[PDB]
Design a protein around this ligand. Structure first.
Ligand SMILES: Cc1onc(O)c1C[C@H](N)C(=O)O
Length: 261
C-alpha cells in the first residue's frame, strides 16, 4: 500500500530555506528552495507523496572514525530513518558503497572562496604560505577529499589543515562564509563551486571565487541500497534535465534573484 516517502534534506541555501512566514506554515509548506522544487518534480514524476524533514545532526554524512557509524543524511538512509535524500549531497566512492545514487542533477567541484582583495588565486598559493589560514566543512566529501588525496599540493594542504590551531574546520557552510567575511582576508574557505558562486551573488558582495575547481563531480538523489525507488528516481532526474527543468531551477535560485548585479 502507498505510504508517505520520508525525504531527508538539509537547511542549506538556496537548496532548502525557511519561507518568510514559516512560523505560520506546516509540513513541506515551511520550506522553499532548489531542492524543495526538485523534490516536488521528482515526486510528481514518480507518482509518490512525501514528507520533507531536516537531517537531525545537520550534517551531510561521514563514517565516524572508530565507531564506524555514519552520521548526517547518509546515516538517515543507512539506518532506515529516511526513504530518500534530496539535497546537495555529493556522489562519492565511500558513500556509493553504503547507499545508492541517481545520475547527477548538478555538476560541480571544490573551489576557493576569498574575501575580495585577498592575495590568493590558487590552491598552490594557499599551500605555499602560512599567513592566510584555510579549512573545510566537517563530515563531508570536501574534507575527505583532502584527507585522501595523494596529489602533492592537496596533501600539503591537508597536512596543515588537520593540525591547525585554532581549528580551521566549520560545522556548516554559513560558518565558513562568516569566517571569511570577518577575517580581513586572513581566512580562505574551501567549498563546492555551486555554493561559492551562490554566495558571490549575495550581499554584501564581499566574497569571490578564485581559480579553477580542484575536481569534477556531482550531486545525486540518494536512496537506501537496493531501494525500489532508485530506478524511477534516476529516470526522473534524466528527464527533468533533458527537458531543461534543472537549468531553469538553477537560474531561478542563483541568478534570477542575484543581489550583486
Ligand atoms: C554543499 C557543500 O558545499 N561545499 C561542501 O563541502 C558541501 C557538502 C558536500 N556536498 C557533501 O556532500 O559533503
Amino acid at each position: 500500500a502507498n505510504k508517505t516517502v520520508v525525504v531527508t534534506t538539509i537547511l542549506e541555501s538556496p537548496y532548502v530555506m525557511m519561507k518568510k512566514n514559516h512560523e505560520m506554515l506546516e509540513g513541506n509548506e515551511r520550506y522553499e528552495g532548489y531542492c524543495v522544487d526538485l523534490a516536488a518534480e521528482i515526486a510528481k514524476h514518480c507518482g509518490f507523496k512525501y514528507k520533507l524533514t531536516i537531517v537531525g545532526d545537520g550534517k551531510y554524512g561521514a563514517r565516524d572514525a572508530d565507531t564506524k557509524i555514519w552520521n548526517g543524511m547518509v546515516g538517515e538512509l543507512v539506518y532506515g530513518k529516511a526513504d530518500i535524500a534530496i539535497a546537495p549531497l555529493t556522489i562519492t566512492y565511500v558513500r556509493e558503497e553504503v547507499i545508492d545514487f541517481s545520475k547527477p542533477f548538478m555538476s560541480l567541484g571544490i573551489s576557493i572562496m576569498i574575501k575580495k582583495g585577498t592575495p590568493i588565486e590558487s590552491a598552490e598559493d594557499l599551500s605555499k604560505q602560512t599567513e592566510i589560514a584555510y579549512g573545510t566543512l566537517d563530515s563531508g566529501s570536501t574534507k575527505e577529499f583532502f584527507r585522501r588525496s595523494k596529489i602533492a599540493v592537496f596533501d600539503k594542504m591537508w597536512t596543515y589543515m588537520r593540525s591547525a590551531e585554532p581549528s580551521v574546520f566549520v560545522r556548516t557552510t554559513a560558518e565558513g562564509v562568516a569566517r571569511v567575511r570577518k577575517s580581513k582576508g586572513k581566512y580562505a574557505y574551501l567549498l563546492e563551486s555551486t555554493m561559492n558562486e551562490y554566495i558571490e551573488q549575495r550581499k554584501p558582495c564581499d566574497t569571490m571565487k578564485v581559480g579553477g575547481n580542484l575536481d569534477s563531480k556531482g550531486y545525486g538523489i540518494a536512496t537506501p541500497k537496493g531501494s525500489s525507488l532508485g530506478n524511477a528516481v534516476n529516470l526522473a532526474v534524466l528527464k527533468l534535465n533533458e527537458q531543461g527543468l534543472l537549468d531553469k531551477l538553477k537560474n531561478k535560485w542563483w541568478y534570477d534573484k542575484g543581489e550583486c548585479g
